[PDB]
């Protein structure tokens, strides 16, 4: 992303595609390494009534 515009233009000419829109090197746009604590949902049988195992 720090490639100068002469090398950036030569590189786009040599590939034939627009390369800065689709860079295979990852930058600030990817997810944060430290994520907030989650709250996972419980299944359908987490009930206190009408929840017999035989049914």
């Amino acid at each position: 992303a720090s490639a100068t515009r002469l090398i950036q233009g030569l590189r786009n000419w040599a590939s034939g595609r627009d390369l800065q829109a689709k860079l295979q090197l990852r930058y600030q746009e990817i997810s944060k390494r430290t994520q907030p604590p989650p709250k996972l949902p419980v299944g359908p049988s987490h009930r206190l009534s009408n929840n017999y195992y035989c049914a």
Binding site: R47, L48, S49, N50
Partner: protein, 226 residues
Amino acid sequence: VGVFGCPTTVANVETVAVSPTICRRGGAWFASFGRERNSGTKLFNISGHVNNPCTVEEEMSVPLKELIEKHAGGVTGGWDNLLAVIPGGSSTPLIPKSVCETVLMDFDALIQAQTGLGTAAVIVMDRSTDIVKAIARLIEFYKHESCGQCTPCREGVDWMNKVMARFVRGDARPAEIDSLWEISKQIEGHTICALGDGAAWPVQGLIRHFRPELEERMQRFAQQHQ
């Protein structure tokens, strides 16, 4: 196999004491009172919130309103002050004021009211009564008086007393009402004697007749503690 392994008949004081009167006075005389297959006289113990709590011998199929208004002078504050009646002692489920107007105090007409006759002990509970505190005290009676022999009573009656002690405060969510109902159905009929049945029945009666009062109890707990 009864007492000492002998043949035995265990019989109530009332059904023993009335039998020489049946043999002297006659069988048709004792059969003339009350309805058919509900024959005879019966002792009734009207206690709770009445003006004159009293024991009285009365004919078998007497209406409940006539009994309470005549022999006990009516409910404290009149009949409009009535909230609920446990009809025959603690083992039977209670009936609300909407059922006590036309109900008859024998076996079969109370079985039609999805309760029982039992001991014919009319406990009257007026509008001034926290009914949830009374039924949780009743389940406290059934866990302090339970011999601990088999599993469902020994575990579930203490567990129903804990759930009812939270229902008094309202420290639950409403999905624990129906849960508690299932606990009663896991006790009623799966025990040795009918104290598991006699402890499952009042929980079922309280839920069936005052579910919205428990729900508004728990929701006002949930808003006043959060």
